[PDB]
Paper text:
CD4+ T cells recognize a broad range of peptide epitopes of severe acute respiratory syndrome coronavirus 2 (SARS-CoV-2), which contribute to immune memory and limit COVID-19 disease. Analyzing six epitopes, some with very low binding affinity, we solve X-ray crystallographic structures of each bound to HLA-DR1. In summary, each peptide bound HLA-DR1 canonically in the “forward” orientation that is described for HLA-DR,48 excluding CLIP. We observed little deviation in the overall structure of HLA-DR1 irrespective of bound peptide, particularly within the peptide binding groove, where the solved diversity of bound peptides had little impact on the position of the HLA-DR1 residues that lined each pocket.
S486–505 bound HLA-DR1 at low affinity (IC50 = 3,046 nM). The refolded complex was crystallized and diffracted to a resolution of 1.8 Å. HLA-DR1-S486–505 was solved in space group P 21 21 2 containing a single copy in the asymmetric unit. HLA-DR1 bound S486–505 via the register FNCYFPLQSYGFQPTNGVGY (core residues underlined). Binding in this register satisfied 3/4 anchor residue preferences for HLA-DR1, incorporating the favored P1-Tyr, P4-Leu, and P6-Ser. Deviation from the motif ideals was observed at P9 by incorporation of P9-Phe, which prefers shorter aliphatic residues. Within the core, this register placed P2-Phe, P5-Gln, and P7-Tyr as potential contact points for TCR recognition. A free cysteine within the peptide did not negatively affect HLA-DR1-S486–505 refolding; however, a strong positive peak in the Fo-Fc map at the P−1-Cys side chain indicated additional density capping the reactive free thiol. A covalently conjugated cystamine, likely from reaction with cysteamine (a component of the refolding solution), modeled and refined well into this density. The cysteamine, however, did not affect peptide-HLA-DR complexation due to its outward-facing orientation.
Numbering used by the authors:
A (entry chain C): 1 to 14
B (entry chain A): 3 to 182
C (entry chain B): -3 to 190
The structure:
């Protein structure tokens, strides 16, 4: 498929 | 060549409202409907050309929610300052009697991304065939939004776009009439 | 007072991943931005290569994320795996989109000056935003008396602009609204014969 890819958000330090 | 593609997300408390969209040079490619959990293409044909897995957006939104809570605590619960919108009403094209056209209510330069928009025909709320965009990003981190009302132009009907927002003391009421 | 109810304070978090493209995809710059309320607090800039705090609030996050070497490797390669990928996904209906302006000329309904005709050139429905709309009298570009709304975004992958000219219309004068736009190789023209 012709797919947009997201960049993943990462959490702050817990 | 000069182009900018922006993946823009947000989360807002205590509303618990999320958003995820892609922007190309200031126009929306798509967003994800958080209630239906599905990709919504800004122009219909885009969905024939491309795809986007909506669960990636939903996962990002969960992380955004977690980070908002942390940042809310870290700032000692410093809330957003309301910035009220600028509202303009225009048509899609030059207006001719009895030739279908479209009224555009352009809502700009506001935050947070919560706004109420009512089309009034001769002073009365009208819902027929209206549509709207999600909140669109700005470089100053405020937002933009468009609302649309298809209409059949006549001499006897007048229109107002009524906009309400926490930064406004009174509703904004922006008028349009046939230029007779 | 207040135009809507529910005035509880609000708290807002925005994330933007910006892919900036120069000369096609010859040059690419990724800019990840974290904004709390209206204040950007930390960013990753691919020209820099690591997270940086914009404000004090962002300092712990820059420190934490710069400790994650996998994450830095991933972000450093995203100019390729994300920006250039997504550029190629949509180039044919975004970068290559060309929608021809519709051009109409008409007298304003408002005619404030005796012996003058206020003319209106309406240019609508076009894509992309770059455009020039100009008025000519006979063969001469009019350099005075012109008023333009500038570029208006309609929110639906089209734009419009409106350009007005006060004319002193003599016999044998021809007024032309002329549009230069990337969708056409020769300018669009619509004329008004006085």
């Amino acid at each position: 498929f012709n797919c947009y890819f997201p960049l993943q958000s990462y959490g702050f330090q817990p | 060549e000069e182009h900018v593609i922006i993946q823009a997300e947000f989360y807002l408390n205590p509303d618990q409202s999320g958003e995820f969209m892609f922007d190309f040079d200031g126009d929306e490619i798509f967003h994800v409907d958080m209630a239906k959990k599905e990709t919504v293409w800004r122009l219909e044909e885009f969905g024939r050309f491309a795809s986007f897995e909506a669960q990636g957006a939903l996962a990002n939104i969960a992380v955004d929610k977690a980070n908002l809570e942390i940042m809310t605590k870290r700032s000692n619960y410093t809330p957003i300052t309301n910035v009220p919108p600028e509202v303009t009403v225009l048509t899609n094209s030059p207006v001719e009697l009895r030739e279908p056209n479209v009224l555009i209510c352009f809502i700009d330069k506001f935050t947070p991304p919560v706004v109420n928009v009512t089309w009034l025909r001769n002073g009365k709320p009208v819902t027929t065939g209206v549509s709207e965009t999600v909140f669109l990003p700005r470089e100053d981190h405020l937002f933009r939004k468009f609302h649309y009302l298809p209409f059949l132009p006549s001499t006897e009907d007048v229109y107002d776009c009524r906009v309400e927002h926490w930064g406004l003391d009174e509703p904004l009421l922006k008028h349009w009439e046939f230029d007779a | 007072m207040g135009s809507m109810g529910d005035t509880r304070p609000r708290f807002l978090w925005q994330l933007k991943f910006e892919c900036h493209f120069f000369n096609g995809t010859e040059r690419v710059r990724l800019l990840e931005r974290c904004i709390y309320n209206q204040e950007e607090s930390v960013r990753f800039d691919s020209d820099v290569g690591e997270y940086r705090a914009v404000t004090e609030l962002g300092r712990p996050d820059a420190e934490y994320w710069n400790s994650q070497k996998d994450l830095l490797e991933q972000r450093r390669a995203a100019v390729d795996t994300y920006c250039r990928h997504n550029y190629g996904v949509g180039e044919s209906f975004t970068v290559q989109r060309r929608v021809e302006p519709k051009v109409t000329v008409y007298p304003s309904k408002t005619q404030p000056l005796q012996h003058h005709n206020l003319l209106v050139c309406s240019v609508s429905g076009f894509y992309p935003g770059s455009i020039e709309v100009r008025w000519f009298r006979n063969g001469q570009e009019e350099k005075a008396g012109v008023v333009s709304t500038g570029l208006i975004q309609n929110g639906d992958w089209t734009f419009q602009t409106l350009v007005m000219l006060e004319t002193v219309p003599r016999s044998g004068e021809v007024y032309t609204c002329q549009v230069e736009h990337p969708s056409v190789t020769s300018p669009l023209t619509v004329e008004w014969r006085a």
